[PDB]
Amino acid sequence: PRKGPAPKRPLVNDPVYGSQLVTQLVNKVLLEGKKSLAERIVYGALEQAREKTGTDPVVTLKRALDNVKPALEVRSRRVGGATYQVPVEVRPDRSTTLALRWLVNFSRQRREKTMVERLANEILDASNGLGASVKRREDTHKMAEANRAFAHY
Amino acid sequence: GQKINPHGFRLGITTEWKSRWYADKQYKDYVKEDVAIRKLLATGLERAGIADVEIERTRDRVRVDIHTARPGIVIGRRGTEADRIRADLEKLTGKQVQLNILEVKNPESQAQLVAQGVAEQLSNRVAFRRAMRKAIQSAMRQPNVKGIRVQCSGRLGGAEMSRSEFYREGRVPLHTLRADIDYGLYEAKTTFGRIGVKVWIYKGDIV
Amino acid sequence: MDVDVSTDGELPGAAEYAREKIGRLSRRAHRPVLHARVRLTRHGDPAVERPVIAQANLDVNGRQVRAQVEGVNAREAVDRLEARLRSRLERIAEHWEARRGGVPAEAGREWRHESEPARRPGYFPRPPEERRIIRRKSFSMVPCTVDEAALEMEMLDYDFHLFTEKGTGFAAVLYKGGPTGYRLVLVIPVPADELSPFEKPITISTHPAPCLTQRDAVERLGLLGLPFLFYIDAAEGRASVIYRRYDGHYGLITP
RNA sequence: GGGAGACUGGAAUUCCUGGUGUAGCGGUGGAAUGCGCAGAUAUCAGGAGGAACACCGGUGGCGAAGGCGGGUCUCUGGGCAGUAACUGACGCUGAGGAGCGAAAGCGUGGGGAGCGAACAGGAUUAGAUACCCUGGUAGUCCACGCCGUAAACGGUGGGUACUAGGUGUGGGUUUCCUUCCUUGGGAUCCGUGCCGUAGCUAACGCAUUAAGUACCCCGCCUGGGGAGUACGGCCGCAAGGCUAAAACUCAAAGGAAUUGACGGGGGCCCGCACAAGCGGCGGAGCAUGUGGAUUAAUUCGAUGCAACGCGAAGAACCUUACCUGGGUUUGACAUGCACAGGACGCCGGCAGAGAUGUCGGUUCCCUUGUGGCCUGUGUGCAGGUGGUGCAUGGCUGUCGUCAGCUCGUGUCGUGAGAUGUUGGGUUAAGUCCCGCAACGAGCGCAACCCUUGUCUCAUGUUGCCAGCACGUUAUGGUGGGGACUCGUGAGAGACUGCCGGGGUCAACUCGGAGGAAGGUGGGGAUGACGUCAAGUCAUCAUGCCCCUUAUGUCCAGGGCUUCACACAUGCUACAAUGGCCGGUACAAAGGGCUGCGAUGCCGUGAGGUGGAGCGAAUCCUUUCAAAGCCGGUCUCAGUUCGGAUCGGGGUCUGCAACUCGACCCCGUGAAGUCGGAGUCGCUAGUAAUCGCAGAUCAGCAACGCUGCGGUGAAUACGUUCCCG
RNA sequence: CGGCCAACUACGUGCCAGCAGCCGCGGUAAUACGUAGGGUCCGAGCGUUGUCCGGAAUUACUGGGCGUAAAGAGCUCGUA
User: Fold this and answer.
1) Does the nearest atom of strand E lie within 7 Å of C44's Cβ?
2) Which fold is adopted by the domain A20-147?
3) C102 touches chain A (CB under 8 A)
């Protein structure tokens, strides 16, 4: 990236939900190229959430994303031969990527005996604002606030 | 190691194989007798400059085509040299082997012959610089020769420190595939050791 | 600290001497060292004036420091290797005491690669000496509404714009209110109801435009650093907007 | 702002006093000593005291030099210009000598706000007698005196005359534009800068203010250290200053400039370099290599990148070069000079671990001169994985597939050298364009080669089967057919070709159409001058040295596999994105004759018997796979995870699986709960994950190496930091 | 008998023995060590040491310099 930005891969829409976000989620949960297993896990989690709440997977998934979507972050910036934790504004794409990554990672540490159940519980808690990803967003926003003095560079 | 052998670089494009026969079960023994023939013809003849040796094999019959700049020296007026080479070629389990002794048209546009001469002069007493100058100036006179580079390495002049020297005249694009580069390497035997001589010569390009 | 010495040939006693000489450099390294190795070799040819060759490699907290020396015997080679390694570790320190003379200092004196770039305003400097006021627009004072004033803003490509309001009959200045939307400042603050109806999302500055002189206005602009100052002139008694121009002079817009 | 004396002005710092007023202030890269809560800092008012004089204020003025600016007054020195009234050579320099002489320092008496050697703590550091922070004594200030040193420098002694100019600036006289305001301009005298001739210089540079051309006087130098030191002497309250050697030692010390290299110097750029990510290593068991230790030997080489699953693409014997022991010597193997010969050679027996020794049967064809075989006798000689990759050739790594490295003629410089190769722009590129004391060229870059992505023509077997017939389940299997693939020949197709816009209308660049592919399409082969005395006398060759009844050569056994540890590369795991069981679908590439080897049969299984068909688009490797999909079960546990280790029983190869092979069956069931400091790989069919094949190979230590395909992500805001 | 400075090869030795006026030669293949051939310069002489002059323009009267190589006193006044 020394010579400029690189092109982005235009990932395709999903067959059984028709949204970009679920395809991004299955790509995030993908491991070792087992795309079929990842799609099975994501579809099962969405169906479990639908059965539990009674509404459409996508709306509660979007609610969870908006609940865990960050807007400010902290990066190590070196100015004048000295490093500081500068709060930085997050672009929408990076916020979505971070939210999905946090959701997947925190659902991987749950104790619901199965990936599908862990993911369903995590997405439901994030929709209701109780998931650990929500806590991570709160902590990162708090850390961005605490270092606001270094926002001028 | 920097430069690969030019003959092998353009083996499939410009140059041609020096051995021509087909074998599936008998490839190994064919190779054995091929290298035996090559070493026999190299050791037997050293006065006349042996430019090249081709071997062709069809079942029993072998055709060995040997090129030299002095055919009269390697051949017998009564067939004495011919009889000697024939007898020593039968003994190599070549069954029926027949030789085609041939002469090169220009014996100074051939890189192997030029390296031969340079090594022979450098061996006894000639200063190396004189050898390269004479070889290069003699090569440029030939019509088709358009470039030449001559390089020698070793204890030049009987010194205690090894050195490498090279002189070029014209164009020698070793990276260009279509241009043909006649390449010749030979080791001169001096009382202080062995001196390596390499010669590259450029005569136009083929497509 | 533990050292492994991979000697070669006949070098009796070289291993212990090298071990004990090199292990003393652990205190010299400012960071923990890991897996520090040494190697001793001897040249077979007697024609070499310095046959013994010593090599040392240290892993100081991930940073590889290596040295190589020649000597006539094991002891001399080990001592020279120790000196070389000491010099290398001295040059490696990277702690504050060794990186304090290269950090950029002062404010304007001296320049370095990482020295803070000078903050340059958009306008040409043109210092207070002969700054002057050489741009005086009086574009429009026909009454307008908020939306009409915003459109008159947009095609003029000007961040702020001074007009006279429809409902109030008073002079007003609109400008981009940043992420909050737009902001409107009046000579006398009035609520939105008296202000003519609008559809753009804007907010009104609660403070009034104060009364002050030309030199006082320039001083306030300099000491307040705003892109412009809207005020009621003391001598004129009417509205005025001063902005630093694109040539360094002040642009005073008057009725 | 030349000097001395006296008087005096304001801002600001510090302190004190009195209001308002609270919980911090101060300080740093970050903090802590420190101050404050007994009222700090902050803000206002008043008072005291000391020092220095913002703006004017500069490469501008004065002074012999040091040096000299708040204001006013008094005393006083010098300089410049004009008139040329006056004296009439009264001039210049000056050994010694006298005087002035920055700062620091000394003495006596005052003063003491700020700063501040010394000295305390605080902080950084491995150590801080320092750099940074909080305090702080002498001193800095005044009066009278001492000292007599400075990078007291323009590193340039004083006086004079001459030698092209151009342009700033200070002071003073005058002619003409003439408003006469105006740096109008000119002329001239005295200063103070910059650029530049001639000239000088080793060069840098000086150049009317000479470091030029000459004259007068003075001071100083005779290689570097020892040494401006010792002794003696003079001065000084003291510190110390001035004058000033020798012994001894070195073969140099130096000045300018050129090419590199380097910088915790700058500028412009690149690269999975960093940043954003994904997966790892470092923790565990095992495989492999290395170090060390051990041993009779643990053969040798390789030590950052660029040694350490490397030489070794196959160590039980052989390999093998190491050790023990047993034999052998023109030798295990070549070729030449000789004497004797018809046997050499084989085949069986015996002894021996074997080498070997011995016994028993077989005996040459030429052609008379002898040749082929060997015997011994020999004699030249062989033979060395013995040493030196710092004597070498050849081969290879690396910087680095980076864009650079040079030459001819010309020009500049006394010369090393310089230009071309720099400058602006552009590129992946010393790629190209425009300029240019340079004009060109060569090796490098690119292209020409292979593969891959599209299409056309040709093409039908062992390859396809779409349309037709026969099929028997067993299917292109069979007759038949070029239609679609495919196989392999030829060709076309990407060339900024076209359009729009930026661009010096130039290179080049952005976007668009078309096309399978758009801007070196993707990946390879190709590695400039050279660097590191890089690696290899163990692929080979080789100069020199060494062994030669041995360091050569034959054999058996052992070793290279040893293990209290250390390092590195990998594999398997720690599990539910999973384990086990059943069913089921898709590849590519490659190999095969004393080899691949099928059907069938026998074993639970390695495997055994057997041999169909194949030198192979045909037969065999199964028709080929595993991940994958479906169904059942396990239910978060040191477990139905993990497989190490160990006991027993077998198969195959090989003369022989003890040291020291692989695999199969039963039992056994360790560490291991995602791994510290630190560190590695990767930008798309990539990382990750799954299987297949080949070389070496009787068998394998293969989890290694080289290829093939299946499924196939995330991220890149941007060059501040790290490496090159 | 390496170059100054006329005149080179072989053997022995190997950082030893040693050579040397200076630069510098001895690291199994030395025209520099020792010995042999060969050669050159001199010759009843040939070399070494000691002393003086020259080369030394290196005390510069003939015939040197002081910006940076050593060298302009810190600056003036002034006696001979």
Assistant:
1) no
2) Ribosomal Protein S7 (1.10.455)
3) yes
